[PDB]
Design a protein around this ligand. Structure first.
Ligand code: MG
Ligand code: MG
Ligand code: MG
Ligand code: MG
Ligand code: MG
Ligand code: MG
Ligand code: MG
Ligand code: MG
Ligand code: MG
Ligand code: MG
Ligand code: MG
Ligand code: MG
Ligand code: MG
Ligand code: MG
Ligand code: MG
Ligand code: MG
Ligand code: MG
Ligand code: MG
Ligand code: MG
Ligand code: MG
Ligand code: MG
Ligand code: MG
Ligand code: MG
Ligand code: MG
Ligand code: MG
Ligand code: MG
Ligand code: MG
Ligand code: MG
Ligand code: MG
Ligand code: MG
Ligand code: MG
Ligand code: MG
Ligand code: MG
Ligand code: MG
Ligand code: MG
Ligand code: MG
Ligand code: MG
Ligand code: MG
Ligand code: MG
Ligand code: MG
Ligand code: MG
Ligand code: MG
Ligand code: MG
Ligand code: MG
Ligand code: MG
Ligand code: MG
Ligand code: MG
Ligand code: MG
Ligand code: MG
Ligand code: MG
Ligand code: MG
Lengths: 296, 169, 211, 145, 159
RNA sequence: AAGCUCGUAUCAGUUUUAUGAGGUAAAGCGAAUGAUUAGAGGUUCCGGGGUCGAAAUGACCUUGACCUAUUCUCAAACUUUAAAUAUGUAAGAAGUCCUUGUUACUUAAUUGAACGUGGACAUUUGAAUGAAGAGCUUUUAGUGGGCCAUUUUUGGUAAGC
RNA sequence: GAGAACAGAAAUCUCCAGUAGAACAAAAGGGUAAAAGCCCCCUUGAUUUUGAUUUUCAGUGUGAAUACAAACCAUGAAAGU
RNA sequence: GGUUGCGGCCAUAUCUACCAGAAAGCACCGUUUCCCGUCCGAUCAACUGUAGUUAAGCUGGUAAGAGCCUGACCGAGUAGUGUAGUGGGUGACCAUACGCGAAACUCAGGUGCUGCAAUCU
């Protein structure tokens, strides 16, 4: 960095470093404060969040609570579990967002017992609706959307995640105006469009058009679809049946594993440089003042 | 090394500093509009100067930022006017370059007495791939040294493709 | 219109600087604090001799200036203007007030009147560096300066090399080694700490061992 | 002033015994300019109690003079005679608190052959009388008893 | 003339601690208070709502109420020759659990144990604390350690 | 002053132990802000003079500022550090543990929260020292010019101010 | 700081550095960085009822403030505020 | 052990300059029909995971590195301070007695620890 820049001792000395997880630009503490702190007269009642994050093409849903030692996963689902349920391609799209939320809701709601009561909407017509509490009986499991750093846009797929955890039985408080098919100039949802997205209707109709206007591109992206003979129109049943498969058995299978922890550990240290000792450092200095000093 | 630490153009920002609002500015605008295909953005004066005859918040200038192929169709076009000779300044320490021209007529575009004649400031900013790191929301970070755009890197880049001259010392 | 200095000998008040709360305060009568061959190198003048307060009191800017001129005048005419380096070690930062004067003791907060340095026991007031051969001249210069000051001060022979913090033999150890290198009129010492690379830049005549 | 009260020294020349722990050291420290103290020998604890030793009994300061007086109020702790009492004192026994509190503060006279110094109110170490004079307390207290 | 507003004289009190400004860490909000708890009071200057008055800085009281974002603390304050009861509405940012009590709770829980460990065995306990006692005798050896004789040193100047 | 309700009981212008609060003294200034003495080495397409000049975004001196590492000196309304004295709370029966009742609060939830029932452990039951006991109620006098000494300390040259 | 016609010490355009050296009506102190600052979007909680509390204190009043209860609303995807 | 998502303490985590990083992950990265946002699909939105890459991010190692953290009879029982005297001294001030006791300095050692969950030669 430029000479006239470059930090003075005093700059560095007084520098107050942010929280690590801010330096990492990973955590909005302002939102977290407000996501996590509980009503003080509700004592040790955990305040569970529904964490939805998007990697370059994996979807992560964890149900999380907080502890001063660290946060706590109740459950976790990933859209890369969806091949197990009959979804192979496009697992980062709106409907993979939906699926996973559904997967996450069903899974936890199971291991909590609220499984057979609170099924949530089994139909799915993209009707706007929260899961209502069963008269005489346990209140539903309540959970708050942790969007993270995601911008709120009307159509964002983080809210796709939200739709399916709510469709799946969770009580996740929310309004309707960030779902595709929310009309800008009228406080009005078109659920016909929102049904469409849940079942990847936009992806499908995008294939149908690329079919007969430009097959150059249609085979680049959408390659996989060709390769498995899934020409569009079936995309709904694909996801319609995922929903089925998921509710039928959400109970989370781990990867088999192959090679042990000890073993993954063994090979990883092969690639991990090791710090030097003081002695070792001393003999590099000494070494240097024989060369750079002793007139070569 | 060298795989995809290539040297794209980040964006081209054309700028007209018309120290006044009113008609003359809305003509300076029209130029950039038809020239960029995009609708230009106006800029208010930052404070009053009075010997420049401007007031705070007046609207004093128009400018427009252009990316991708469209930015080259124009760069080239201006570079022509400059007869493919810039100067050893012009290029900034952090790897950008700019030049100016007067009379935009010298890059296609007829005369039209009802629009007049304007000069332009061309400013080309360079970067490589992976520049997103700086610009994105999450895990915003800074490009590593040996991936930063530098003067040498940009001048040599310029000297090659375009096959234009640098000049001076 | 100066009050006699007896009215401000003692440190009766918390320090009253020139500040943005004060502001209208007169200049210090002392204003140059380094006379003689100040440009001189450290190796040039090894003998240091101090004029050293034996009292907790206040010295006026006026008496610093008068004392300044006294020691400097004597010194240069007996032994030459480049024969020595006089350093005044004490700056008059403390503003003295005056209740100048119908109304009595009503609203009595005074106006700035002049300045004083506040000075400890054993606090150094004047420092000089010369050639050993010139000791007596220097010592007589500080002796004559004394009569310009209230209170007891007493002249003390330094252990140190000029304005250095090292005793003469220790400064000699570092010097006749590599370690010491000239600067303006002071000196820079080689550190065992920090970048080895640009430690070698400076102090080239080190990184041997010998002469 | 408070400390002198708690140590039961509320008039000049009266004295009491003190078990030394950190928590009484610091008491002693706070009153060094008003007191003279030291380490008493068997001889002077014995002659203190034989001569100027008084029980506290339903208040009422009662002279020791017969062993039944002691056994009636300290018997509960073992301690059924005057030399039992002394023994609890000098060895700082398990019942030094009850034993020692039993003893009314000793009322002493002025030193008979005097203070040995021109001025009492500086430390023993500066040719005064106050503070810890260690074993030199026995000479003082005998002269006072 | 004089001035005596609420936060008067509090420049350094409510000030923030060197290189510790900004968001308060989330542990301050995860802590949990129950009526009866003993708390110390100290103002977070960056949290203007729910602040103790400066009189209560450094002061320790007992929780009497738990509220959505706060706890009610009762402090005993002495005015004239008497104490009066004071009740404070403090946000959880200006409060922490006092450890003025652990040495007790830790000591109780322990005191029960060695009492069980005694009884069950056949008594002989002794579990009151005791002050520092004076030192017992001891024999210090000279071997490897003959005494070094020092004397006072002459006057000297260095300067 | 009148008492009144009780009494080994509860009490304390004190210590100890444990656990807080504080920004004064000192200190610091080759640490931030603000002051302040001196050189040394840098940097100008760019503050001014001057030599060469047709000029130069020319070259060379020149003096300024600015930068780098040093240097002497300071703060009631400066400060990273930071005392001593003083200061909040705790040292048990109104305690600790087990069992599991009440509610309209609260929980996804007989979950929690608060108040409880039943059960277990006595004076080394939880530091020191002291305790002509402790608590409590009514009513009413005089007073509401104060002054002095050690220490801290403001204004003032100072004062038996 | 380094860069771009007219354009200059000061106009407008760009990149780098930047712990706050700014800004937040106002005195000054405290506070504040994906904010408490700047730009935009929606708004009237600057509302309704009546208590408790902190400072000043007599533990009166007044000013100002705090944390709840019972309404009705605002905003936000939401926790919330 | 690596890595990711969510974290706690918030520099032993920061800063400057170099170099090394398997596997997975993360990333950069391709696209503009659709929701959505822009002067600009750079950011923001969506779509593909296909076409490309470890260059950067990220992680780690190096440095008589700047900073930060820890320790010591390093400085210093120094400065300051509670208590004492019909102590010294014209005074300014200063010794002593019984206690409490720093900061700078100097030197040495260090440079993130760790919770939940998923994944990986
Ligand atoms: Mg700088
Ligand atoms: Mg430095
Ligand atoms: Mg910050
Ligand atoms: Mg937010
Ligand atoms: Mg590559
Ligand atoms: Mg004009
Ligand atoms: Mg004084
Ligand atoms: Mg005064
Ligand atoms: Mg007058
Ligand atoms: Mg008159
Ligand atoms: Mg007046
Ligand atoms: Mg005035
Ligand atoms: Mg004199
Ligand atoms: Mg006793
Ligand atoms: Mg006799
Ligand atoms: Mg005789
Ligand atoms: Mg006689
Ligand atoms: Mg006498
Ligand atoms: Mg006698
Ligand atoms: Mg005032
Ligand atoms: Mg407010
Ligand atoms: Mg103060
Ligand atoms: Mg101060
Ligand atoms: Mg001071
Ligand atoms: Mg000082
Ligand atoms: Mg300091
Ligand atoms: Mg300074
Ligand atoms: Mg020095
Ligand atoms: Mg106390
Ligand atoms: Mg007390
Ligand atoms: Mg008793
Ligand atoms: Mg009694
Ligand atoms: Mg009365
Ligand atoms: Mg009265
Ligand atoms: Mg009256
Ligand atoms: Mg009267
Ligand atoms: Mg007196
Ligand atoms: Mg302000
Ligand atoms: Mg934020
Ligand atoms: Mg109003
Ligand atoms: Mg009234
Ligand atoms: Mg009021
Ligand atoms: Mg790979
Ligand atoms: Mg479009
Ligand atoms: Mg893109
Ligand atoms: Mg996006
Ligand atoms: Mg690499
Ligand atoms: Mg990352
Ligand atoms: Mg270092
Ligand atoms: Mg003292
Ligand atoms: Mg005296």
């Amino acid at each position: 960095a430029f000479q006239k820049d470059a930090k003075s001792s005093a700059y560095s000395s007084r520098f107050q470093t942010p929280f690590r997880r801010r330096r990492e630009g990973k955590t909005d503490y302002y939102q977290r404060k407000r996501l996590v702190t509980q009503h003080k007269a509700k004592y040790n009642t955990p305040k569970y969040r529904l964490v939805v994050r998007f990697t370059n093409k994996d979807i992560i849903c964890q149900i999380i609570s907080s502890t001063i030692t660290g946060d706590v996963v109740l459950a976790a689902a990933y859209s890369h579990e969806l091949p197990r349920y009959g979804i192979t391609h496009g697992l980062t799209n709106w409907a993979a967002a939906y699926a996973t939320g559904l997967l996450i809701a069903r899974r936890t709601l199971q291991k909590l017992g609220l499984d057979e009561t609170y099924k949530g909407v089994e139909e799915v017509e993209g009707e706007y609706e929260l899961t209502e509490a069963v008269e005489d009986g346990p209140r539903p499991f309540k959970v708050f959307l942790d969007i993270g750093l995601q911008r709120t846009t009307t159509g964002a797929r983080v809210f796709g995640a939200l739709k399916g955890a709510s469709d799946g039985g969770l009580y996740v408080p929310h309004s309707e105006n960030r779902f595709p098919g929310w009309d800008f100039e009228t406080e009005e949802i078109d659920p016909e469009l929102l049904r469409s997205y849940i079942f990847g209707g936009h992806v499908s109709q995008y294939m149908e058009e690329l079919a007969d206007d430009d097959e150059e591109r249609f085979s680049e992206l959408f390659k996989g679809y060709l390769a498995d003979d899934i020409d569009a129109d079936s995309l709904e049943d694909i996801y319609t049946s995922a929903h089925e498969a998921i509710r039928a058995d959400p109970a989370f299978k781990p990867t088999e594993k192959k090679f042990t922890k000890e073993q993954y550990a063994a090979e990883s240290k092969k690639y991990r440089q090791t710090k030097l000792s003081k002695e070792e450092r001393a003999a590099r200095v000494a070494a240097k003042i024989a060369a750079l000093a002793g007139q070569q | 090394q060298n795989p995809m630490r290539d040297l794209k153009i980040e964006k081209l920002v054309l700028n007209i500093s018309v120290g006044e609002s009113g008609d003359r500015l809305t003509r300076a605008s029209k130029v950039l509009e038809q020239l960029s295909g995009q609708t230009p953005v106006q800029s208010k004066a930052r404070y009053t100067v009075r010997t420049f005859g401007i007031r705070r918040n007046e609207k004093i200038a128009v400018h427009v930022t252009v990316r991708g192929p469209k930015a080259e169709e124009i760069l080239e076009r201006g570079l022509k006017v400059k007869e493919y000779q810039l100067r050893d300044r012009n290029f900034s320490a952090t790897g950008n370059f700019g030049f100016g021209i007067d009379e935009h007529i010298d890059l296609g575009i007829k005369y039209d007495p009802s629009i007049g004649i304007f000069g332009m400031d061309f400013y080309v900013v360079m970067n490589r791939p992976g520049a997103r790191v700086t610009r994105r929301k999450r895990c915003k970070g800074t490009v590593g040294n040996s991936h930063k755009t530098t003067k040498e890197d940009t001048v040599s880049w310029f000297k090659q493709k375009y096959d234009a001259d640098v000049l001076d010392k | 219109a100066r009050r006699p200095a007896r009215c401000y000998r003692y440190q009766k008040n918390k320090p009253y600087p020139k500040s943005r709360y004060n502001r209208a305060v007169p200049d210090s009568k002392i204003r140059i604090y380094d006379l003689g061959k100040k440009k001189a190198t450290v190796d040039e003048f090894p003998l240091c001799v101090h004029l050293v307060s034996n009292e907790l009191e206040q010295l006026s800017s006026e008496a610093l200036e008068a004392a300044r001129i006294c020691a400097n005048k004597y010194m240069t005419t007996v032994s030459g203007r480049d024969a020595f380096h006089l350093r005044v070690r004490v700056h008059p930062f403390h503003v003295l007030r005056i209740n100048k004067m119908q109304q009595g003791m009503r609203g009595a907060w005074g106006k700035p009147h002049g300045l004083a340095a506040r000075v400890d026991i054993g606090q150094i007031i004047f420092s000089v560096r010369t050639k050993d051969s010139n000791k007596d001249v220097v010592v007589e210069g500080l002796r004559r300066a004394r009569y310009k000051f209230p209170g007891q001060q007493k002249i003390i022979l330094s252990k140190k090399w000029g304005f250095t913090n090292l005793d003469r033999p220790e400064y000699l150890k570092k010097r006749e080694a590599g370690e010491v290198k000239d600067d303006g009129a002071f000196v820079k010492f080689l550190s065992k700490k920090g970048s080895l690379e640009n430690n070698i830049r400076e102090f080239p005549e080190y990184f041997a061992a010998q002469a | 002033r408070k400390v002198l009260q708690l140590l039961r020294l509320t008039r000049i020349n009266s004295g009491t015994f003190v078990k030394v722990t950190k928590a009484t050291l610091e008491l002693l420290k706070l009153i060094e300019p008003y007191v003279a103290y030291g380490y008493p020998s068997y001889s002077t604890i014995r002659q203190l109690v034989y001569k100027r030793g008084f029980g506290k009994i339903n208040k009422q300061r009662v002279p020791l003079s017969d062993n039944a007086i002691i056994e009636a109020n300290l018997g509960k702790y073992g301690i059924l005679s005057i030399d039992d009492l002394i023994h609890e004192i000098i060895t700082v026994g398990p019942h030094f608190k009850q034993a020692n509190n039993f003893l009314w503060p000793f009322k002493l006279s002025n030193p008979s052959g005097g203070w040995g110094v021109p001025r009492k109110f500086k430390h023993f170490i500066q040719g005064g009388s106050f503070g810890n004079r260690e074993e030199f307390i026995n000479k003082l207290v005998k002269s006072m008893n | 003339g004089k001035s005596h507003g609420y936060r008067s004289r509090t420049r350094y009190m409510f000030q923030r601690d060197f290189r510790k400004h900004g968001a308060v860490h989330l542990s301050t909000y995860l802590k949990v208070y129950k009526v009866g708890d003993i708390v110390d009071i100290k103002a977070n200057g960056s949290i203007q709502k729910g602040m103790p008055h400066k009189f209560y800085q450094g002061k320790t009281g007992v929780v009497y109420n738990v509220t959505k974002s706060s706890v009610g603390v009762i402090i005993n304050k002495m005015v004239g020759n008497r104490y009066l009861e004071k009740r404070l509405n403090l946000r959880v940012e200006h409060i922490k659990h006092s450890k003025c009590r652990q040495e007790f709770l830790e000591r109780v829980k322990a005191n029960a144990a060695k009492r069980a460990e005694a009884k069950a065995q056949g008594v002989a306990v002794q579990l009151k604390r005791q002050p520092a006692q004076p030192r017992e005798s001891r024999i210090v050896s000279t071997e490897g350690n003959v005494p070094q004789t020092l004397a006072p040193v002459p006057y000297e100047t260095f300067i």
